[model samples]
Target: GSLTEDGLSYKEKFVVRSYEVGSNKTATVETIANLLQEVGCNHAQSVGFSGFATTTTMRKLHLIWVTARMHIEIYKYPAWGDVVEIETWCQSEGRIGTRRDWILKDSVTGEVTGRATSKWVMMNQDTRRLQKVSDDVRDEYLVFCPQEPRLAFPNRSLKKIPKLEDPAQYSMIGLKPRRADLDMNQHVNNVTYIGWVLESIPQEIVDTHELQVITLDYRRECQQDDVVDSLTTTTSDSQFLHLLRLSGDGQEINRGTTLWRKK
Candidate 1:
């Protein structure tokens, strides 16, 4: 019901419980992604705009994080019993793309857990293509958007990670897209990509270290029937690269990179 930074951001309280944690006993990347959506929609509602809708009704606008580049610098991934406070807010509107940022921390100790930034563009549900933000739409949501950014990063776009051609440079495996992976957009949900990327990492690295930062560049969408392969590469002990593509044609689906910290 209230806002922050002179009425620019919206904050909410959340808990990291059983359902949101991984075998590591910490919040999974997908968990944070889902929480971001919650605060984002709440931010919209706090701004006098109606929250997102699955289908774009006559008055609804469906926003898609088509090219998300979340860079989460984690001090600690909240454990199952931990509580957290998250704040999210959007920047000034653009022609097609808009920006949002998030800051998360421990509710009791006040220790910073992570911060992230993302870019989104409007999509026409039927056309399923990128579209512009209309004036009528923008006007309704304008005052809610702030001129200043909440969190700053290197850039909105992730560094371009080229494809690997040599098998020796990476590890590759296959997976079948499942029904549960699909979101409201009728494709494998975006957050699911984080799990796939981690799956491609080395066991030693995955076991010894915790993820400190992550950058992802989503390229193509995956369908329930699609057979995809996860290809991974390593620059060093704590640096990992991932590229998910269609096995049938090697069409690049998405690329991701992560930095880790020893526990």
Candidate 2:
């Protein structure tokens, strides 16, 4: 792994491990999600732009970054033992948000396998309040960011994920967060939300198709004690709308939309 683009971006190579592959022997979406997170964190720390929570300045300020939304599109999944190179970079996404983007490619053939983009917001750990990325705070990391950042998905914004209503085709209830599900910030990690969203997906689709694209909009944080419910509604044979909410208060946790392709 090394920093690229004059330290403004980071690139790392990873071999798809046996455990990372699914029944079809290709890397699963969860594997891709985890690797994306690993590379992003590595990139931030390498550039000392550790505002993602790896830097002393952010810790001293009691600030932490939390994921708000993510969009990923997979063109092809790498099979086991294939080496994949992933590159990541960051930029401002508004006054209060920061965005990170990644491009995944086959190390040998240089073929693009996937792309992902995510938006994150700041939180004051002590107050648990969302904070705006002030010029002072933004400047700390901007030194390592590009003047004009490149986007993995250019000129396109993800559409809002619709809320799943009652009488859905499939529902899964009483899902509790395990102790291991909590991340460094003591909240259920974003990747865990992906699993919950897929809980109610029909098995027939799971067996016959592969997820080509996924967009997630996180609404509220889930705590260790919260009981979750997942609901899904199929818009078409290839598209699905999903929701995860608290079983206790029925408050929304996350909303998702996914597109699948025949395997």
Candidate 3:
């Protein structure tokens, strides 16, 4: 719960709660994702920037931030009740988007647990179209960003997550969203998409291997009425390409690739 010297990065501490863990008594991947989201939101709040702010540039412009792509890699999993500290910071991404990066560490041991990076773009809430950052808006946010660019995965951009082709080896059809699947913004939560992606993977792989890296490209926001089809195909013994699409129109919702290692 401290800021760096430049105040560009914010840090927060989180306990791996019992509900956040799975059968292995370790925090689940979704839990890690949720924590990263929380820390990023908190960082924004600390700098007078938040989704719920009464007077903000985004609200004034009727624009909302949306994730275009995200990549996460976990080197170690924290067990239930373990304290983990996360530091998050943002950087400019050309003219259309911003990049956020995070580093998670064991609070006691000070060992790095995981790292994540994401690209976010502004979208018009009413028109549902991507918007470019104007000079004034960019200047306002750039004051809180790092002077120099930084990355969680320096060598791995994960810019190209291929779409799952036809005749997927594993597929789940007619998957409908439950009421609990929506976030505060009312769109399907990004974490829910991970569950849908894994649904198409064979149970054997889920049982024998642990996910090491994941890259997701969000094409469109999935709505409540949409029926999703999850498809997965193995690219290698431990890597898989996945796709989620509307069952009716076949419109791509998200494309992802995950790398797993034997547990």
Candidate 4:
């Protein structure tokens, strides 16, 4: 028996209904986090393994692609509480780790709803550090059908952002953080930041374009109940930059850019 067969042998089913939608018509950040957890759990269970998976457990979503041109297509106006089906599986072996892809679809209409891909590194539960994936683990993951790997996106360094003259030029929308937005660190969760950035985009852009790349720089921590004034501006036809600042105080928390294309 091969390790790929052992690792890729399991299929996990996820059901998404309307109640999971947040204030916006899109799926909630908490819901996405839950789905990631479920997928990770299913992957772990299939291999008969268990340990603290730090990256997946407490993740910092470094980037997001929300343009109409995205590898994973998101619906423009998803009806409230639409039942969506999500299927996830390990897809490839990287230099130091593995990659996973998730396909989300409308359960009733069978229309594709959303898709997400993530990378994970194995870690030792006791040492609390990343560890090399065992041979058994690696072999078990290769059993699934392998799809063509998507093209790598452009990468940008956060250190390059110095100062912008008119912040409004890049401003798109703003959101006020709530007490519930705080995570274990007593600050807003990293994933929530990604959700806000995604939510700030107008539905027309999301429905009409595809997101090619996203780069994020976590500059400061946002406290609980902080009113974050978000601003997004298009730097280019296909590229947009965003800034998240504490309202009134003018403290910058996070900044990033997203590139979009046509489907």
Which numbered prediction scores highest in TM-score against the true structure? 3
Clashes of each: 0, 0, 0, 26
- Summarize candidate 4's per-residue lDDT along 50-162 as a digit string, tens digits: 32232322223221111111123344324455655566665555435665555566677776665555445554433435555556544545444355553222123222443
Q: Global lDDT of each model?
A: 0.71, 0.85, 0.86, 0.54
User: Better model by TM-score, 2 or 4?
Assistant: 2
Q: Which candidate is the best by lDDT?
A: 3
Give TM-scores for every candidate, taking all chains together and pairing residue i with residue i: 0.84, 0.94, 0.95, 0.52
The RMSD of every model to the true structure, in order and in angstroms, is 3.2, 1.8, 1.7, 8.2
> What is the C-alpha lDDT profile of model 3 across 1-263, one tens digit per residue?
76678899999999999799977889989999898888888888888876432227778888878888888998888999899999999899868778889999999999998999988888888998987988777778888887776777775555677777899999999998888988786778888888888899898887888888888899987898889999999988399899999999999999999889998
Report the number of backbone clashes for model 1. Answer: 0
Worst 10 residues of 1 by lDDT: 50-59
Indicate whether candidate 1 or candidate 3 has the larger lDDT: 3
The list of candidate 3 runs beyond 4 A from truth reads: 51-55
Q: Tens digit of lDDT per residue, candidate 2, span 1-263?
A: 88995888899999999999988999989889989999998887786645254345678788888788888999999999999999998888657778889999999999999999998888887787888877777777777678785879973246776778788789999998897788775778778888888889888888999989989998888889899999999998399889898998889989889889997
lDDT of 2 at 109: 94
Tell me how many residue pairs clash in candidate 2. Answer: 0
Q: For candidate 2, what is the lDDT?
A: 0.85
